[PDB]
Amino acid sequence: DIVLYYFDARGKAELIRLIFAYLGIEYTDKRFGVDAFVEFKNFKKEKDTPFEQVPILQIGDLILAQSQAIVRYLSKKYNICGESELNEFYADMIFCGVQDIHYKFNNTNLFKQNETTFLNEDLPKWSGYFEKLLKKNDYYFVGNNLTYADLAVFNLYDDIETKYLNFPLLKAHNEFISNLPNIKNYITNRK
Amino acid sequence: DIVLYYFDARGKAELIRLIFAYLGIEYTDKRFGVDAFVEFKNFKKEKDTPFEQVPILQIGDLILAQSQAIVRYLSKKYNICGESELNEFYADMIFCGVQDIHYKFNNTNLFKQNETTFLNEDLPKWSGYFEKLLKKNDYYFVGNNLTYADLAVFNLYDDIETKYLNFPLLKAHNEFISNLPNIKNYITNRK
Amino acid sequence: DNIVLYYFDARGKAELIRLIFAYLGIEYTDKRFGVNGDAFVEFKNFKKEKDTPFEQVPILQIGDLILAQSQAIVRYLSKKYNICGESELNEFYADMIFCGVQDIHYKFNNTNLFKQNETTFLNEDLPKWSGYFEKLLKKNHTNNNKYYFVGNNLTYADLAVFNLYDDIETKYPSLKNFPLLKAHNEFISNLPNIKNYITNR
Amino acid sequence: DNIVLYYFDARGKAELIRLIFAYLGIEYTDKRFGVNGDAFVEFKNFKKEKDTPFEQVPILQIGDLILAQSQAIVRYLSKKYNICGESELNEFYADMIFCGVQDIHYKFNNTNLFKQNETTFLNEDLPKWSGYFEKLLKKNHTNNNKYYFVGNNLTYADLAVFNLYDDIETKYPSLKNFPLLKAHNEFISNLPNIKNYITNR
C-alpha cells in the first residue's frame, strides 16, 4: 500500500529490490541523485529516520530502516525465511556470512592494494564455505525452498562480478537464481 | 542440555553470555587461551564450523555459528524479541544500529588517530540516536518488556566504557540493566 | 633513460608520479595494466617477470633499476629535481604536508556508499583537513601573492594537495569555504605543463 | 636543546622516534599523555596550547620549533644523524623499506578479535611481509655477516623493522621460519643503547 529510498546504486538496497522483484511486489524505487547529497540531506530533514541512514522502506506511514532488518522482516512476512526454527537460523547464519564477505568486497580497492589478497585469499576461502554449505543441503542453501539466503548469495557474487565461480554448485545455484523468471526479468531491465 | 566456544575475551561473545546470564541458562563458557591461537586451530580441526569462526554455540550435537544469528535465535526462543511483528522489527533494527557503532568502536585506536573523531563525533551522534529512540518509547527500547536490544545497548556502552553518558535516558537505561539481578551478579563475578 | 612506470590503468597511487613527470617534462613510458585485457592477469605476469620488493605497484623502472613504493619514489624524484624545498626545515615541512595528504587521501579511498561513510567524509573529515591545509597556506602568506605551501617555489607537496582534491572531485562534489586552498589548486592546475597533461589525460 | 616529545603513554607511532633518540643518545623529555590522568583531556589541552598542523601527535618540539607527523620526524632525524644511508640509492631503499613497514604495521594495528582478522593477519599477511623482509636481507648478504637492510651501516629502516616485530610480539606470538629477519631483530635488540633503553622501558 510502498517506497524504497536509497541512492541511485545497488549498494545495500539491491537485495531488497531483488526480494520485491521475486515476490512480485509493486513499489516505488526512489533513488537519490538520478547532487545526490543535497537530496539526501533534504530527505533526512523531511523524513524521521532512526539513524540518518538509508535505505529506508516506507510502507504507508511506517518507516523501516536498516537493510538487513528490512530483509528479515520481508522474508518472514513472505515465507522465504525457512520452515523450521533450525532452518530459519541457518538462513540467518548464512546471510551473516554473506555480510562478512560482502563488506570485505566493499573494502577492497586499488588504492588500498588489497585486491590481490581478496581475489587470492579471502574470496576463494568464502566461496569454499558456501560451496560446502550447498553440498550439505534440478539448488537451495536451506531446506527445499528458496530463502533470502539464496538471494543474498546471488546478490553477493553478482556484485563482485561487476568489478572482478572453481565452485560447481555455487555456479549452478547462481545460474538457477538468475533464471527465476521474476529475477531474470528484473535483471534484464536493470540499469 | 550447552557449550559456548570463544576466546578468553568479551568480544562478540559477551552479548550471548549476557543473555544466558539473564535467562538463567547453565552452560559451559569455554575460552581459548586461558597459545590461544594453537588452541583455536585445533578447535577448528575438531569441530565442524561453517566459516571457521567463533563464537560457536553447541547445544548437544547441534553447532550454531555467527554471533548475531545466535542472539536472534535465543531471543526468539526465550521471549526477548518483542511481542509483535513491528516490535520484533524494531528490536532488530536497533541491534543493527548497535552493530554499526560497536564495530566503529572496535575500529578506533591510538595508532589510527581516530580516537578523537570517535569520541567527539561518532559516539555522540549515535548516543543521540539511541537517546531519541528511548524517548519515543521506573526503561525499554521496545514495547514494555526487555528485549535483546536492551542488552545489546547495555553491552555496547559497557564495552566502550572499558576503554574510554550527556544522555539522561541512556544512562538510566544502562543503570537499570546493570542492576537486574541476574545481570548484576554476572557482572560482579566477571573477570 | 628508458623510464617505465608500471601501474594499473587508473590514477590511484600513481597519479602523483605522473603529475611530477609532467611538471618536470620527463619522458617515460606509462605502462598501464588492464587497458584492454584482464588487469589482474597482467599484474600477475608482471610480478613473475619483474623482481618487486613487495609485490606491489607502482613500480618505476629506470634502466634496469627497479623502484617501488609511491611515496618513496615521489621523494626520490623530488630531491633529484629540486622540488623538495631549499632548506632542511622546508624539506621537512613539505614532507610533513605530504604525510598529511596521505592520511586524508587514504580516508577518501576508504569512503563509499556501502560503508555509509560518505556523509561523514564530506561533512566532517574533509572539511577539517581542508581547514588544516588552508591554515598552512595562510602561514606562507608573505611569500605568496602564486600559492605555495612551502617557501617560494613549488614543491611536491603542492602537487600532492592538488592531486588529492582533483581525485576527490572525480567522485564527489566546492572548496567554497576554502579560498586559499581553492586558489592554490587552481593555480597548480594552470601551470602550463600541468594544464596540458590534464587536458590530455 | 630543549627537546620534548609529546605523545600518549603508549608506543604507537612514537616508539620509533624514541628508539632513534635512544640509539643516538639524544636527551629529551618524553611527555606522555595519560600517565596518570585522563589522556584525552590532556591531549585536548595540548592542542589548545600548542599550534599543531593537523591536531595530531606525535609532536616533537625542539626549542620553539614544532614538528609533526611521525614518519617525517623520523626522516628528518635520520638525515641529521646519518642513519639514512650514504648514497642516493641507499637513501631511497631505506625509505622504500620503511614504507613497507608502515603498511604492515598499519595492518597489525587494524587487527583484532572483534574484527575476526587475527588468524588471517597471523597466518597470511604477516608471513608474507616477513618473507619480503627476509628476501631484502638476503640481497644485502655481501655486506652482512651484523645485519643491515641497507648498505653496511645501520639505518632507520633497521630500527623500524625491529620496532614493528617488537610491537607485534607484545600482542601475538616466533619468526622461526625467517632466520635472517630473526637474527636481524636480535642484533638490533642487542645494540647497547637499544638494549638498555628496552630494559628500562
PDB file of C-alpha atoms in Angstrom, chain C:
ATOM      1  CA  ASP C   1      66.777   6.899 -19.964  1.00  0.00           C
ATOM      2  CA  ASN C   2      64.436   4.043 -20.547  1.00  0.00           C
ATOM      3  CA  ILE C   3      61.939   5.088 -17.893  1.00  0.00           C
ATOM      4  CA  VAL C   4      58.887   2.980 -17.425  1.00  0.00           C
ATOM      5  CA  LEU C   5      56.107   3.463 -14.902  1.00  0.00           C
ATOM      6  CA  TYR C   6      54.051   0.395 -14.174  1.00  0.00           C
ATOM      7  CA  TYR C   7      50.639   0.589 -12.631  1.00  0.00           C
ATOM      8  CA  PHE C   8      47.032  -0.151 -13.222  1.00  0.00           C
ATOM      9  CA  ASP C   9      45.033   1.849 -15.719  1.00  0.00           C
ATOM     10  CA  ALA C  10      43.962   4.194 -13.023  1.00  0.00           C
ATOM     11  CA  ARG C  11      45.142   7.191 -11.148  1.00  0.00           C
ATOM     12  CA  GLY C  12      45.426   5.651  -7.723  1.00  0.00           C
ATOM     13  CA  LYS C  13      48.818   5.959  -6.177  1.00  0.00           C
ATOM     14  CA  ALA C  14      50.472   6.512  -9.483  1.00  0.00           C
ATOM     15  CA  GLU C  15      48.958   9.776 -10.477  1.00  0.00           C
ATOM     16  CA  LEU C  16      51.167  11.984  -8.387  1.00  0.00           C
ATOM     17  CA  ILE C  17      54.186  10.426 -10.017  1.00  0.00           C
ATOM     18  CA  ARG C  18      52.663  11.075 -13.408  1.00  0.00           C
ATOM     19  CA  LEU C  19      52.000  14.684 -12.456  1.00  0.00           C
ATOM     20  CA  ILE C  20      55.607  15.104 -11.407  1.00  0.00           C
ATOM     21  CA  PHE C  21      56.868  13.748 -14.693  1.00  0.00           C
ATOM     22  CA  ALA C  22      54.518  16.077 -16.493  1.00  0.00           C
ATOM     23  CA  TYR C  23      55.569  19.062 -14.484  1.00  0.00           C
ATOM     24  CA  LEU C  24      59.246  18.329 -14.995  1.00  0.00           C
ATOM     25  CA  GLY C  25      58.803  17.335 -18.614  1.00  0.00           C
ATOM     26  CA  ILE C  26      60.383  13.926 -18.257  1.00  0.00           C
ATOM     27  CA  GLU C  27      59.530  11.402 -20.953  1.00  0.00           C
ATOM     28  CA  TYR C  28      58.574   7.965 -19.861  1.00  0.00           C
ATOM     29  CA  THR C  29      56.524   5.016 -20.799  1.00  0.00           C
ATOM     30  CA  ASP C  30      53.312   4.881 -18.923  1.00  0.00           C
ATOM     31  CA  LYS C  31      52.513   1.232 -18.781  1.00  0.00           C
ATOM     32  CA  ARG C  32      49.086   0.518 -17.553  1.00  0.00           C
ATOM     33  CA  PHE C  33      47.615  -2.808 -16.631  1.00  0.00           C
ATOM     34  CA  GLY C  34      44.190  -3.594 -17.907  1.00  0.00           C
ATOM     35  CA  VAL C  35      43.796  -1.024 -20.571  1.00  0.00           C
ATOM     36  CA  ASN C  36      42.319  -3.744 -22.719  1.00  0.00           C
ATOM     37  CA  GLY C  37      42.799  -7.043 -21.038  1.00  0.00           C
ATOM     38  CA  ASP C  38      42.456  -8.540 -17.618  1.00  0.00           C
ATOM     39  CA  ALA C  39      44.332  -6.253 -15.297  1.00  0.00           C
ATOM     40  CA  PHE C  40      44.934  -8.996 -12.788  1.00  0.00           C
ATOM     41  CA  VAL C  41      46.460 -11.369 -15.258  1.00  0.00           C
ATOM     42  CA  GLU C  42      48.726  -8.649 -16.460  1.00  0.00           C
ATOM     43  CA  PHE C  43      49.699  -7.799 -12.901  1.00  0.00           C
ATOM     44  CA  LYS C  44      50.304 -11.429 -12.071  1.00  0.00           C
ATOM     45  CA  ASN C  45      52.582 -11.831 -15.054  1.00  0.00           C
ATOM     46  CA  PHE C  46      54.367  -8.617 -14.228  1.00  0.00           C
ATOM     47  CA  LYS C  47      55.199  -9.836 -10.795  1.00  0.00           C
ATOM     48  CA  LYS C  48      56.635 -13.016 -12.206  1.00  0.00           C
ATOM     49  CA  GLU C  49      58.701 -11.094 -14.710  1.00  0.00           C
ATOM     50  CA  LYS C  50      59.868  -8.277 -12.525  1.00  0.00           C
ATOM     51  CA  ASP C  51      61.557  -8.588  -9.205  1.00  0.00           C
ATOM     52  CA  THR C  52      59.466  -6.454  -6.906  1.00  0.00           C
ATOM     53  CA  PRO C  53      60.191  -5.986  -3.259  1.00  0.00           C
ATOM     54  CA  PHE C  54      56.632  -6.135  -2.006  1.00  0.00           C
ATOM     55  CA  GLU C  55      54.612  -7.455  -4.935  1.00  0.00           C
ATOM     56  CA  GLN C  56      53.069  -4.079  -5.325  1.00  0.00           C
ATOM     57  CA  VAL C  57      52.790  -1.318  -7.859  1.00  0.00           C
ATOM     58  CA  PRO C  58      53.516   1.343  -8.694  1.00  0.00           C
ATOM     59  CA  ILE C  59      56.919   0.379  -9.941  1.00  0.00           C
ATOM     60  CA  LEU C  60      59.184   2.828 -11.626  1.00  0.00           C
ATOM     61  CA  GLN C  61      61.982   1.296 -13.674  1.00  0.00           C
ATOM     62  CA  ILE C  62      64.878   3.399 -14.752  1.00  0.00           C
ATOM     63  CA  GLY C  63      67.174   1.370 -16.908  1.00  0.00           C
ATOM     64  CA  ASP C  64      67.348  -1.878 -15.068  1.00  0.00           C
ATOM     65  CA  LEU C  65      66.794  -0.246 -11.739  1.00  0.00           C
ATOM     66  CA  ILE C  66      63.510  -1.059 -10.003  1.00  0.00           C
ATOM     67  CA  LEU C  67      61.971   1.442  -7.599  1.00  0.00           C
ATOM     68  CA  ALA C  68      58.923   0.712  -5.516  1.00  0.00           C
ATOM     69  CA  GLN C  69      56.501   2.473  -3.154  1.00  0.00           C
ATOM     70  CA  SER C  70      54.886   5.529  -4.500  1.00  0.00           C
ATOM     71  CA  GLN C  71      55.804   7.875  -1.689  1.00  0.00           C
ATOM     72  CA  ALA C  72      59.425   6.877  -1.772  1.00  0.00           C
ATOM     73  CA  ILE C  73      59.503   7.353  -5.490  1.00  0.00           C
ATOM     74  CA  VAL C  74      57.971  10.777  -5.099  1.00  0.00           C
ATOM     75  CA  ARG C  75      60.558  11.773  -2.553  1.00  0.00           C
ATOM     76  CA  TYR C  76      63.398  10.463  -4.706  1.00  0.00           C
ATOM     77  CA  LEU C  77      62.307  12.344  -7.786  1.00  0.00           C
ATOM     78  CA  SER C  78      61.594  15.446  -5.812  1.00  0.00           C
ATOM     79  CA  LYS C  79      65.100  15.567  -4.428  1.00  0.00           C
ATOM     80  CA  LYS C  80      66.614  14.902  -7.755  1.00  0.00           C
ATOM     81  CA  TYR C  81      64.649  17.564  -9.489  1.00  0.00           C
ATOM     82  CA  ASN C  82      64.629  20.225  -6.865  1.00  0.00           C
ATOM     83  CA  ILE C  83      61.036  20.206  -5.810  1.00  0.00           C
ATOM     84  CA  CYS C  84      61.586  19.284  -2.210  1.00  0.00           C
ATOM     85  CA  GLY C  85      62.308  22.646  -0.654  1.00  0.00           C
ATOM     86  CA  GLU C  86      65.552  24.520  -0.328  1.00  0.00           C
ATOM     87  CA  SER C  87      66.350  24.195   3.342  1.00  0.00           C
ATOM     88  CA  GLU C  88      66.385  21.435   5.887  1.00  0.00           C
ATOM     89  CA  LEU C  89      63.338  22.844   7.531  1.00  0.00           C
ATOM     90  CA  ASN C  90      61.471  23.387   4.300  1.00  0.00           C
ATOM     91  CA  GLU C  91      62.202  19.856   3.214  1.00  0.00           C
ATOM     92  CA  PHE C  92      60.700  18.694   6.453  1.00  0.00           C
ATOM     93  CA  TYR C  93      57.609  20.820   6.004  1.00  0.00           C
ATOM     94  CA  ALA C  94      56.962  19.562   2.502  1.00  0.00           C
ATOM     95  CA  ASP C  95      57.328  16.015   3.812  1.00  0.00           C
ATOM     96  CA  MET C  96      55.031  16.815   6.767  1.00  0.00           C
ATOM     97  CA  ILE C  97      52.378  18.158   4.472  1.00  0.00           C
ATOM     98  CA  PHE C  98      52.600  15.158   2.175  1.00  0.00           C
ATOM     99  CA  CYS C  99      52.155  12.892   5.161  1.00  0.00           C
ATOM    100  CA  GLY C 100      49.007  14.778   5.939  1.00  0.00           C
ATOM    101  CA  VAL C 101      47.843  14.371   2.353  1.00  0.00           C
ATOM    102  CA  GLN C 102      48.384  10.675   2.595  1.00  0.00           C
ATOM    103  CA  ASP C 103      46.167  10.469   5.605  1.00  0.00           C
ATOM    104  CA  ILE C 104      43.147  12.184   4.160  1.00  0.00           C
ATOM    105  CA  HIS C 105      43.715  10.589   0.776  1.00  0.00           C
ATOM    106  CA  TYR C 106      43.589   7.177   2.304  1.00  0.00           C
ATOM    107  CA  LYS C 107      40.368   8.161   4.009  1.00  0.00           C
ATOM    108  CA  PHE C 108      38.842   9.255   0.736  1.00  0.00           C
ATOM    109  CA  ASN C 109      39.779   5.918  -0.686  1.00  0.00           C
ATOM    110  CA  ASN C 110      38.090   4.186   2.194  1.00  0.00           C
ATOM    111  CA  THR C 111      34.880   6.081   1.712  1.00  0.00           C
ATOM    112  CA  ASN C 112      31.970   4.581  -0.103  1.00  0.00           C
ATOM    113  CA  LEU C 113      28.223   4.099  -0.239  1.00  0.00           C
ATOM    114  CA  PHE C 114      28.205   0.564   1.029  1.00  0.00           C
ATOM    115  CA  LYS C 115      30.110   1.611   4.094  1.00  0.00           C
ATOM    116  CA  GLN C 116      27.762   4.524   4.657  1.00  0.00           C
ATOM    117  CA  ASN C 117      30.606   6.855   5.448  1.00  0.00           C
ATOM    118  CA  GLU C 118      30.173   9.294   2.578  1.00  0.00           C
ATOM    119  CA  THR C 119      28.345  11.880   4.572  1.00  0.00           C
ATOM    120  CA  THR C 120      30.817  11.922   7.425  1.00  0.00           C
ATOM    121  CA  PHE C 121      33.701  12.095   4.903  1.00  0.00           C
ATOM    122  CA  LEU C 122      32.082  15.044   3.043  1.00  0.00           C
ATOM    123  CA  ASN C 123      30.628  16.688   6.045  1.00  0.00           C
ATOM    124  CA  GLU C 124      33.241  16.132   8.740  1.00  0.00           C
ATOM    125  CA  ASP C 125      36.593  14.668   7.710  1.00  0.00           C
ATOM    126  CA  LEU C 126      37.286  16.523   4.504  1.00  0.00           C
ATOM    127  CA  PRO C 127      36.340  19.991   5.757  1.00  0.00           C
ATOM    128  CA  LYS C 128      38.586  19.534   8.716  1.00  0.00           C
ATOM    129  CA  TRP C 129      41.554  18.613   6.529  1.00  0.00           C
ATOM    130  CA  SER C 130      40.732  21.357   4.082  1.00  0.00           C
ATOM    131  CA  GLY C 131      40.965  23.636   7.075  1.00  0.00           C
ATOM    132  CA  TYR C 132      44.343  22.320   8.010  1.00  0.00           C
ATOM    133  CA  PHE C 133      45.626  22.974   4.529  1.00  0.00           C
ATOM    134  CA  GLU C 134      44.006  26.370   4.397  1.00  0.00           C
ATOM    135  CA  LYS C 135      45.764  27.322   7.598  1.00  0.00           C
ATOM    136  CA  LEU C 136      49.078  26.063   6.317  1.00  0.00           C
ATOM    137  CA  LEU C 137      48.716  28.201   3.241  1.00  0.00           C
ATOM    138  CA  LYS C 138      47.992  31.156   5.450  1.00  0.00           C
ATOM    139  CA  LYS C 139      51.281  30.700   7.258  1.00  0.00           C
ATOM    140  CA  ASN C 140      53.115  31.140   3.998  1.00  0.00           C
ATOM    141  CA  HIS C 141      51.333  34.372   3.200  1.00  0.00           C
ATOM    142  CA  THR C 142      54.402  36.554   2.883  1.00  0.00           C
ATOM    143  CA  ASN C 143      55.867  34.602   0.040  1.00  0.00           C
ATOM    144  CA  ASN C 144      52.588  34.080  -1.648  1.00  0.00           C
ATOM    145  CA  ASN C 145      50.626  36.518  -3.759  1.00  0.00           C
ATOM    146  CA  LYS C 146      51.357  32.404  -6.763  1.00  0.00           C
ATOM    147  CA  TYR C 147      50.454  29.984  -3.986  1.00  0.00           C
ATOM    148  CA  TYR C 148      52.926  27.629  -2.445  1.00  0.00           C
ATOM    149  CA  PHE C 149      52.740  25.570   0.702  1.00  0.00           C
ATOM    150  CA  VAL C 150      56.403  25.749   1.395  1.00  0.00           C
ATOM    151  CA  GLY C 151      58.823  28.564   0.732  1.00  0.00           C
ATOM    152  CA  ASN C 152      58.601  30.434  -2.522  1.00  0.00           C
ATOM    153  CA  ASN C 153      58.972  27.700  -5.038  1.00  0.00           C
ATOM    154  CA  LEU C 154      56.846  24.756  -5.922  1.00  0.00           C
ATOM    155  CA  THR C 155      57.309  21.507  -4.050  1.00  0.00           C
ATOM    156  CA  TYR C 156      55.796  18.107  -4.406  1.00  0.00           C
ATOM    157  CA  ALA C 157      53.537  18.963  -1.547  1.00  0.00           C
ATOM    158  CA  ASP C 158      51.806  21.437  -3.871  1.00  0.00           C
ATOM    159  CA  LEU C 159      51.280  18.790  -6.425  1.00  0.00           C
ATOM    160  CA  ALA C 160      50.119  16.336  -3.826  1.00  0.00           C
ATOM    161  CA  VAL C 161      47.467  18.640  -2.474  1.00  0.00           C
ATOM    162  CA  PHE C 162      46.301  19.450  -5.963  1.00  0.00           C
ATOM    163  CA  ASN C 163      46.126  15.768  -6.791  1.00  0.00           C
ATOM    164  CA  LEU C 164      44.216  14.884  -3.697  1.00  0.00           C
ATOM    165  CA  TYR C 165      41.431  17.405  -4.371  1.00  0.00           C
ATOM    166  CA  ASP C 166      41.394  16.562  -8.031  1.00  0.00           C
ATOM    167  CA  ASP C 167      40.892  12.947  -7.169  1.00  0.00           C
ATOM    168  CA  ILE C 168      38.169  13.696  -4.727  1.00  0.00           C
ATOM    169  CA  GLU C 169      36.408  15.836  -7.287  1.00  0.00           C
ATOM    170  CA  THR C 170      36.071  12.962  -9.685  1.00  0.00           C
ATOM    171  CA  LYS C 171      33.818  11.295  -7.226  1.00  0.00           C
ATOM    172  CA  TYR C 172      32.211  13.841  -5.049  1.00  0.00           C
ATOM    173  CA  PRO C 173      31.253  17.407  -5.356  1.00  0.00           C
ATOM    174  CA  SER C 174      33.222  23.041  -3.991  1.00  0.00           C
ATOM    175  CA  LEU C 175      36.051  24.301  -1.786  1.00  0.00           C
ATOM    176  CA  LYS C 176      33.879  27.369  -1.483  1.00  0.00           C
ATOM    177  CA  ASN C 177      34.736  27.814   2.169  1.00  0.00           C
ATOM    178  CA  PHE C 178      38.454  27.435   1.496  1.00  0.00           C
ATOM    179  CA  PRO C 179      39.593  30.303  -0.682  1.00  0.00           C
ATOM    180  CA  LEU C 180      43.317  29.943  -0.274  1.00  0.00           C
ATOM    181  CA  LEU C 181      43.197  26.233  -0.977  1.00  0.00           C
ATOM    182  CA  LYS C 182      40.893  26.688  -3.879  1.00  0.00           C
ATOM    183  CA  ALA C 183      43.114  29.332  -5.402  1.00  0.00           C
ATOM    184  CA  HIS C 184      46.116  27.176  -4.796  1.00  0.00           C
ATOM    185  CA  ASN C 185      44.639  24.256  -6.589  1.00  0.00           C
ATOM    186  CA  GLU C 186      43.525  26.424  -9.442  1.00  0.00           C
ATOM    187  CA  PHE C 187      46.987  27.874  -9.738  1.00  0.00           C
ATOM    188  CA  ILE C 188      48.584  24.477  -9.879  1.00  0.00           C
ATOM    189  CA  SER C 189      46.031  23.312 -12.416  1.00  0.00           C
ATOM    190  CA  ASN C 190      47.066  26.159 -14.658  1.00  0.00           C
ATOM    191  CA  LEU C 191      50.765  25.615 -14.718  1.00  0.00           C
ATOM    192  CA  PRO C 192      51.273  25.002 -18.388  1.00  0.00           C
ATOM    193  CA  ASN C 193      52.860  21.541 -18.158  1.00  0.00           C
ATOM    194  CA  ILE C 194      50.155  20.510 -15.752  1.00  0.00           C
ATOM    195  CA  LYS C 195      47.243  22.003 -17.647  1.00  0.00           C
ATOM    196  CA  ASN C 196      48.409  20.306 -20.763  1.00  0.00           C
ATOM    197  CA  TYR C 197      48.815  16.960 -19.065  1.00  0.00           C
ATOM    198  CA  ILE C 198      45.389  17.214 -17.594  1.00  0.00           C
ATOM    199  CA  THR C 199      43.675  18.156 -20.743  1.00  0.00           C
ATOM    200  CA  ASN C 200      45.201  15.153 -22.454  1.00  0.00           C
ATOM    201  CA  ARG C 201      44.534  12.710 -19.727  1.00  0.00           C
TER     202      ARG C 201
END
